[PDB]
Design a binder for this molecule. Structure first.
Ligand SMILES: C[As](C)(=O)[O-]
Ligand SMILES: [Ca+2]
Ligand SMILES: [Ca+2]
Ligand SMILES: [Ca+2]
Ligand SMILES: [Ca+2]
Ligand SMILES: [Cl-]
Ligand SMILES: [Zn+2]
Ligand SMILES: [Zn+2]
Ligand SMILES: [Zn+2]
Ligand SMILES: [Zn+2]
Ligand SMILES: [Zn+2]
Ligand SMILES: [Zn+2]
Ligand SMILES: [Zn+2]
Ligand SMILES: [Zn+2]
Length: 748
């Protein structure tokens, strides 16, 4: 399939027991795990039939053999036994309901009670509809169902009782309960047999017979303990131990630390635990039992953070770490994808491999060597330069003896790192004098310099090194209140030890043909196309400098061309005021443009015409806010680093030699009068000639392949559908000199 998601499991924050499966949530990703049988588990995304992206909680209806999926966006999905999804978007669509936070997802029979920042919602699981919302727009701390259709609600430190047979959408229908306990301190409540338990913020746990509600202290857990409600019992998870409360107030203690969720069915003797950063584990509910670990065979990225990505030597290189003026503390993470499996270098791994006092945080740029895929460098914003070699971190460069200059004692912020054609590492440093540096990995020699016009600026962006040796670096920040963010082009002229022979041009602001400013505030992305043009993206859109190699030699300020699109009477600049985060260039010299808030665009050679655009609305794209791009020129897979994780789109730009056109097909075949939209040519390769002819041979439609698909309205010039018969699709790729003749029928 054309779209795919490369999502992370990692921190299991929730767990639910199913008669034959164990559903669990890790960072918003829902997934299944087999019980008695050795796994046969499953990962569930929007591609699997789900209606939304980040899972906020789950619960199972033993009676309806269905799972309720509640999303961070307020959306609801019902996963039936057959694996059929039913959407319940009433909460998400309610604009007035501004807080979607969920506190309790209680499933009683064939009803689900959702208590959150929106109120208390009654979900009809069998019929996917919400017949009522009590306390609408008020945070409801918890919910509990009792005998004789009675419902218990904890809101604003008050406990209310109400009969479901009355109009509980009316405040007068509920009765406020005065109980001997500090109700304002109650963080959770749940029913266990003939009792109701109340957990207090200070750790205490109160128990009360459901027929009297007279509270007495059951146990004294540690402060800020968590309560997990289950049909089998209640779990009081304190720091270092759990309290399992069951019928008749039997309490069992277990030394299980950092527990985020528990799953157990009414008649189960084993509970499934969510240990977060560890994952899943099963526990036999008996005094002398240990939580036996659950296996996670799923391999994915370390996290879903793709701040910066690069594609080299048939591998993806990604940096998760965050950038800002002082937006630090994000755990360091380097992710490498083989095309099948992941390799993750996290904060702890790197610190152990190198040893000592440094923090390995905010990894923000990658630089891969030419010829050695396992030899790459990583720039951390605050912790220095890192050398990776043969699957381990072999060195950390920061401070004295190194050219990695520190802006503060122990603070070296490294961004815009790249390698030259000669195998040297060029890079820039933030908030220091000798800004620009070079490292010879072979001779292990260092050289740093700067140009007064660019020296001591807060932060640079990314570096592109043109074939003639020119180095382009974008300016992300000078200082607090400075608009002097441009681009610096420079050539060291083979001697990184001197500036005396260098050529450089600092272009604070670019101009058009008429000598006016473009108007860009910041340059976020830069790309060299096949026509020797440096296409750059900014806060006000995209624009390219033609013959970029001659800028240092030219006798004028470089001219930037803002692409012009649309028909002759109605023209415009291709995406004005749209913040462009990344640019990648096709085998066809077409441009893949990532934007902050308006999805993904595919533009023509000169960026004049939009060839395609993908958003959350029109495509399986996870988020309209894309942070990075990377393209596998060999199999045509474009990696899309969205704010909500990694995705891949088959561009059809692949260098797949044999059987490349063996996959072309038309659907629907035959084309019946009840199918109005027309036909779709699929399994193509971008850049292909596609022509439709009658059995005679006269062409009726002709195009080039944009993506993997081409569409035909299947009608004549008169707008009425084309006559019955056998039509033919001739596909020719100019590159391989091979053709594909496929036929489809139009029937009465
Ligand atoms: C591993 As190679 C020498 O083909 O870049
Ligand atoms: Ca050398
Ligand atoms: Ca020089
Ligand atoms: Ca989102
Ligand atoms: Ca080809
Ligand atoms: Cl029903
Ligand atoms: Zn119903
Ligand atoms: Zn993160
Ligand atoms: Zn990048
Ligand atoms: Zn290689
Ligand atoms: Zn190597
Ligand atoms: Zn040297
Ligand atoms: Zn200068
Ligand atoms: Zn084109």
């Amino acid at each position: 399939g054309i779209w795919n998601t490369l999502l992370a499991i990692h921190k299991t924050e929730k767990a639910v027991e199913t008669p034959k499966k164990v559903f669990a949530v890790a960072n918003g990703v829902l997934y299944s795990v087999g019980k008695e049988a050795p796994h046969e588990a499953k990962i569930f995304d929007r591609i699997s039939g789900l209606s939304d992206t980040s899972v906020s909680s789950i619960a199972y209806s033993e009676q309806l053999k269905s799972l309720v999926i509640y999303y961070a966006s307020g959306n609801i999905d019902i996963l039936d036994e057959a694996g059929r999804v039913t959407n319940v978007p009433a909460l998400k669509d309610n604009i007035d309901l501004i807080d979607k936070t969920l506190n309790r997802l209680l499933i009683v029979g064939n009803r689900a009670y959702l208590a959150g920042g929106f109120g208390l919602s009654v979900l009809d699981v069998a019929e996917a509809r919400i017949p009522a919302t009590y306390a609408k727009g008020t945070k409801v701390t918890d919910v509990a169902k009792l005998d004789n259709d009675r419902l218990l609600m904890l809101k604003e430190g008050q406990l209310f009782i109400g009969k479901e047979t009355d109009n509980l959408q009316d405040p007068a229908a509920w009765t406020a309960l005065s109980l001997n306990l500090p109700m304002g301190s109650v963080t959770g409540l749940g029913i266990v047999g003939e009792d109701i338990c109340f957990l207090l913020a200070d750790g205490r746990v109160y128990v009360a017979a459901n027929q009297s509600f007279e509270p007495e202290l059951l146990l004294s857990s540690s402060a800020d303990s968590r309560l997990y409600v289950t049909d089998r019992g209640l779990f009081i998870c304190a720091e270092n131990r759990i309290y399992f409360i069951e019928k008749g107030r039997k309490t069992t203690q277990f030394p299980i630390a950092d527990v985020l969720g528990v799953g157990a069915m009414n008649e189960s003797n084993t509970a499934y635990i969510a240990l977060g950063e560890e994952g899943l584990a099963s526990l036999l509910l008996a005094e002398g039992s240990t939580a036996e670990a659950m296996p996670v065979a799923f391999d994915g990225p370390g996290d879903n953070d793709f701040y910066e990505m690069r594609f080299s030597h048939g591998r993806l290189y990604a940096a998760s770490g965050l950038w800002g003026t002082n937006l630090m503390g994000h755990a360091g993470m380097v992710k490498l994808y083989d095309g099948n499996r992941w390799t993750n270098f996290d904060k702890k791994t790197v610190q152990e491999q190198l040893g000592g006092g440094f923090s390995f945080n905010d990894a923000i740029d990658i630089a891969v060597s030419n010829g050695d895929p396992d030899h790459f460098f990583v720039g951390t914003w605050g912790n220095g330069l890192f050398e990776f070699k043969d699957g381990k971190a072999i060195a950390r460069y920061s401070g004295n003896e190194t050219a990695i200059a520190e802006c503060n004692p122990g603070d070296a912020r490294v961004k815009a790192i790249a390698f030259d054609n000669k195998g040297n590492l060029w890079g820039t440093l933030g908030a220091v004098g000798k800004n620009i540096f070079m490292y010879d990995p072979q001779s292990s020699t260092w050289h740093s310099f700067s140009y007064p016009d660019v020296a001591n600026l807060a932060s640079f962006g990314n570096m592109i090194i043109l074939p003639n040796g020119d180095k382009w670096v974008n300016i992300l920040h000078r200082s607090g209140g400075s608009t002097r963010k441009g681009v610096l082009i420079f050539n060291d002229r083979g001697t990184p030890e001197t500036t005396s022979d260098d050529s450089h041009l600092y272009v604070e602001q670019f101009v058009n043909r008429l000598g006016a400013a473009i108007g860009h505030k910041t340059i976020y992305a830069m790309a060299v196309d096949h026509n020797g043009s440096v296409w750059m993206g900014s806060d006000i859109g995209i624009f390219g400098v033609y013959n970029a190699a001659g800028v240092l030699s030219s006798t004028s300020t470089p001219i930037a061309v803002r692409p012009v699109g649309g028909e002759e009477p109605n023209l415009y600049y291709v995406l004005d005021k749209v913040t462009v985060t990344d640019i990648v260039v096709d085998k066809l010299n077409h441009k893949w443009v990532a934007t902050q808030g308006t999805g993904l665009y595919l533009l023509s050679e000169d960026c004049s015409k939009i060839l395609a655009q993908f958003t959350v609305e029109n495509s399986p794209l996870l988020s309209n806010n894309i942070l990075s791009l990377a393209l596998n020129d060999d199999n045509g897979l474009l990696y899309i680093g969205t704010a909500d994780g990694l995705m891949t789109f088959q561009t059809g730009t692949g260098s797949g030699s044999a059987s490349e056109l063996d996959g072309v097909y038309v659907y629907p075949n035959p084309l019946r009068p009840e199918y109005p939209d027309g036909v779709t040519i699929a399994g193509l390769q971008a850049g292909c000639s596609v022509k439709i002819t009658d059995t005679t041979g006269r062409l009726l439609y002709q195009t080039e392949s944009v993506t993997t698909e081409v569409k035909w309205n299947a009608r004549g010039a008169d707008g009425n559908r084309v006559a019955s018969g056998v039509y033919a699709v001739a596909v020719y790729d100019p590159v391989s000199k091979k053709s594909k003749l496929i036929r489809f029928a139009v029937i009465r």
